[PDB]
Design a protein around this ligand. Structure first.
Ligand SMILES: NS(=O)(=O)c1ccc(-c2cnc3[nH]cc(-c4cccnc4)c3c2)cc1
Length: 344
């Protein structure tokens, strides 16, 4: 009947109220988002004199413990990064309030899904895509710091925010499903569109799963549509195969989930399993053609615009192919990605 002396609801969320004042400091403005974790509100900080984003965790032990691991990762990042220059959202502080853990972040503008929607899902230019690619590669190089070794584990357009609507700066949010490198505890990770082959196949994985995600993300920013839009795991693998061909035999030989997607013929080679109810043959949906390297960009809409020549498109195509390498050991790393001709 009553949850937390009337402050909470049945679903463990704080009942957010316009104009409420917390601790004689934070003036609550409005609800901006909700997740499984809880809620996120926009608020004004009267001591520091600036707008902030407050992540209000649910009043329940399972989410409280999850949030504590996030708080550990951000304070570890803040320790190494004092100058605030590696493109991760800054955690200013955290506090307990009416039995809720609250995390105080810097206020940024909208996310990259919202930008895609504002283009009518037609995508942004190659000049802006280059600038997002550079900052994201720099961000992944920071997470690959040996003392950190952080895997975000859920990179998508929703978790990339623009700092200011009228500038090109971006930041990565939401380390709630993140972890430091180690022994495998989880197999069902990453959002399906952005999920690596090694995860689909049930194999060992490391920080390279974020680089696969980034490759998928950068094509989507320019074309406006998801590169691999699986409705289930079997659809996801089939769309990956359409573009990149059948995975190498020596990986499928080790993969415990290979037979969910493929089948091993008498000759020792792997073939796709049939479906109930229309795919192009392996590797015939070329990225060259998806990007429109010789036909003026996605949908022919970039023909005549500067920074969209055939030479510029081949630099982008090449970089993206190295990010979508099947083998996580040879897939390009943040340091080397920054040295590509696309950023030169
Ligand atoms: N207009 S909107 O699409 O509803 C929206 C929602 C939240 C945010 C926003 C602004 N600043 C933020 N700082 C930290 C976050 C954030 C993001 C994801 C998970 N937890 C906090 C965060 C989110 C911006 C725009």
């Amino acid at each position: 009947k009553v949850y937390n002396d009337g402050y909470d609801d049945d679903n463990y969320d704080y009942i957010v109220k316009n104009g409420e004042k917390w601790m004689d400091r934070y003036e609550i403005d409005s609800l901006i988002g909700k997740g499984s974790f809880g809620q996120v509100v926009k608020a004004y900080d009267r001591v520091e004199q600036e707008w902030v984003a407050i992540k209000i965790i649910k009043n329940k032990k399972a989410f409280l413990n999850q949030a504590q691991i996030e708080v550990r990762l951000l304070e570890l990042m803040n320790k190494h990064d004092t100058e605030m220059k590696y493109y991760i959202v800054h955690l200013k502080r955290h506090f307990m309030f009416r039995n809720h853990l609250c995390l105080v972040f810097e206020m940024l503008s909208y996310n990259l899904y919202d930008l895609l929607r504002n283009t009518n899902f037609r995508g942004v230019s190659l000049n802006l895509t280059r600038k997002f690619a550079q900052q994201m590669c720099t961000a992944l190089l920071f997470l690959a710091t040996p003392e950190l070794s952080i895997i975000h584990c859920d990179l998508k357009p929703e978790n990339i925010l623009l700092c200011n609507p009228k500038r090109s700066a971006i930041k990565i949010v939401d380390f709630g499903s993140s972890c430091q490198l180690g022994q495998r505890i989880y197999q069902y990770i990453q959002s399906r569109f952005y999920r690596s082959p090694e995860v689909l196949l049930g194999m060992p994985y490391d920080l390279a799963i974020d680089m696969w995600s980034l490759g998928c993300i950068l094509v989507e920013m320019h074309t406006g549509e998801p590169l691999f839009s699986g409705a289930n795991e079997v659809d996801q693998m089939n769309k990956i195969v359409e573009v990149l061909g059948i995975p190498p035999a020596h990986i499928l030989d080790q993969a415990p989930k290979a037979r969910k997607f493929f089948e091993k013929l008498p000759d020792g080679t792997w073939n796709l399993k049939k479906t109930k109810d229309e795919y192009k043959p392996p590797g015939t949906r070329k990225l060259h053609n998806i990007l429109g390297v010789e036909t003026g960009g996605p949908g022919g809409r970039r023909a005549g615009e500067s920074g969209h020549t055939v030479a510029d498109y081949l630099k982008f195509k090449d970089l993206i192919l190295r990010m979508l390498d099947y083998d996580p050991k040879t897939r390009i790393q943040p340091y080397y990605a920054l040295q590509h001709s696309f950023f030169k």
